[PDB]
Amino acid sequence: EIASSLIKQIFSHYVKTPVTRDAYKIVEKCSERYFKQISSDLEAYSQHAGRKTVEMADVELLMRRQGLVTDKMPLHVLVERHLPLEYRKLLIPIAVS
């Protein structure tokens, strides 16, 4: 149930070219589908580790499974590259490099 303005702004920010209204509504649909899919995957990770919480390691494993985190492209780099300072502070209070 994510805000359509945020989704349009992120999506346009990346796509860099004009998008029709209908295309955007599609991206929204796809975004809802994305969260459904990953919710089930995180459940598997957690349930498998015998706990009721999602831990950082769970989401890193997710992103590794998605082809995002690799040996060439570690998580800390994705954090540095893609998230604002106040978030990096929280995630990387000390260099993990």
Binding site: E1, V15, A23, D58, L75, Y87
Partner: protein, 75 residues
């Protein structure tokens, strides 16, 4: 405008799995994987459009792209 609606993320996941608890700040990595998903979707869509010599992104571009990228987004 890079600030994430953390409460919202928590609610979306709650909606799909009400008994999953997210530990501290894990929502920030979830949101990161979402940005990376939309980045991938944006690149795939743009490529479809380019393939059509379409100067703007159309629903069919994003539809084919979503299919591809959601497949790539499996855990």
């Amino acid at each position: 405008r890079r600030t994430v609606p953390r409460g919202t993320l928590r609610k979306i996941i709650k909606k799909h799995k009400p008994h999953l608890r997210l530990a501290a700040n894990t929502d920030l990595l979830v949101h990161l994987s979402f940005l990376l998903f939309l980045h991938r979707l944006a690149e795939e869509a743009r490529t479809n459009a380019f393939e059509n010599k379409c100067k703007i992104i159309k629903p069919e571009h994003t539809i084919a792209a979503a299919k591809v990228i959601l497949k790539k987004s499996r855990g």
